[PDB]
Amino acid sequence: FTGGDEYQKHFLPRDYLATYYSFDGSPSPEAEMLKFNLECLHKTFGPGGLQGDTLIDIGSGPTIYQVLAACDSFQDITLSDFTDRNREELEKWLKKEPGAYDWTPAVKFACELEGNSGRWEEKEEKLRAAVKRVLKCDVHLGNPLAPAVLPLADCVLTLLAMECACCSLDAYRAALCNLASLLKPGGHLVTTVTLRLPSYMVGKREFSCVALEKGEVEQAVLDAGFDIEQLLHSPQSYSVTNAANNGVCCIVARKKP
């Protein structure tokens, strides 16, 4: 199973973005996966949804799409990733440096969900302003952000990373408890997990995944001290050449006080 050393040495954010977030304008399963997540996130963080002071995104990778809805409802956002190269990409985007990845199609889609795709620059800058820090994280640690110690948060967000970080169902179950430690009682975990996925491509390089069934994920969430508040499933899959998953599950879970 590809572990931390393999990520640190060999995970290339530019290859990751080209595989899963190409914005080539074509009809594609990768685009549909992004759309599904953007839809779930608008439901979760838009009008009538979750709101609070602090949100921590765990395993952000080099991507910012996952917090476009969130920045309307959480004023202090932390992004975090295990892989140094990924944190560098995030900082390029936040700083508006020349090498920053162009997320415009996703920003526009996020705004479209809110009823006006024309306000995309406003959303882009609102997110950028809301992101206060970019930190190392490791979900296997009791405190995933160690040696940083943040105040307990209103929300922990994590998309498509836990199943890459964890080699087994047991590792995944423990990692959920580690995320739960970052939350206030009554706080929420928001997570999207790909199902029955054993591996995924990042450009020409293969990385491992733990193959999880949604029943297992659901039990793991309950066992980590949460209840399930919302659950949104789709059969949507990536190209099987990239990642042969059996659909996808987005879960909003509340840490029981």
Ligand SMILES: Nc1ncnc2c1ncn2[C@@H]1O[C@H](CSCC[C@H](N)C(=O)O)[C@@H](O)[C@H]1O
């Ligand atoms: N132990 C660990 N703790 C936290 N993140 C880890 C990790 N091991 C691997 N990762 C991260 O898991 C991510 C998987 S790719 C998912 C990226 C992004 N959240 C998206 O929505 O596309 C990578 O960014 C990788 O660095």
